[PDB]
């Protein structure tokens, strides 16, 4: 039942890693979408035949000398290039979330959460949304033992024809006097 | 009894791998097809004719050296093989049986 549960960000103990876990909040602050690489290209000058790098980590190393057994096979140390044409990215942003002011308790400071939104879900956080957002929440490494911890994006839920539908008003009457009546209808 | 202890493989151009079929046997059957010399054209681009061919050639056969060197290798192995000299002396034997 734990994903469907809405957490405040400070109940997300650091025994719910690992796991598909929905959180209740209020997006503070979006990055521009950035182009993480999830398979580095690379084209061989002296063979032809690229070679490919799958990307795990927040860093990666650039290769250099051919692996590949067309120049292995003949000792031949050709040389690795990037490509970007051939690599493939995916479409990262970051985004952070930070608990509503009803899920903060008596004198607490209001604490937030690093979200990570990869593929087609990217850009469906704005600042300012009230949203639920369920994801796996997970460690990075950098301390020593203190972990970075983020939220990976799943799902999103927000939580908050005319031009013959005007004539409902038109034809209703009385248009300027109750218009002007229904600003801040409460008010004398 | 002995638990492993390395060494370094290495590779090297070598007459039993120019003779494969990739070797010399590729010349002659794309040499006379694709380098054509012509009257109509200058010196520099007919030498650039036969060179391209050979150089695509050593590339495909031995991808390590420089062209200047694999030039240099052949000459050398050519000077210093009876295989390959067997199968040179049986070129021109072929032919001269012609
Ligand atoms: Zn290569």
Redesign the interface.
Known sequence: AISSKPLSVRQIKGDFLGQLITVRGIITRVSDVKPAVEVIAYTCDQCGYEVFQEVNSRTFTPLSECTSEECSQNQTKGQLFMSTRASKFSAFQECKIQELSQQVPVGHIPRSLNIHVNGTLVRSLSPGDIVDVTGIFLPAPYAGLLTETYLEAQFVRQHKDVEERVMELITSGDVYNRLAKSIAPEIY | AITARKRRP??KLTAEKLLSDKGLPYVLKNAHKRIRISSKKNSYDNLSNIIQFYQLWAHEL???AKFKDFMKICQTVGKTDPVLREYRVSLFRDEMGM
Request: glycine share 0%; no cysteine.
């Open positions: 290495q590779v031995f991808p390590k």
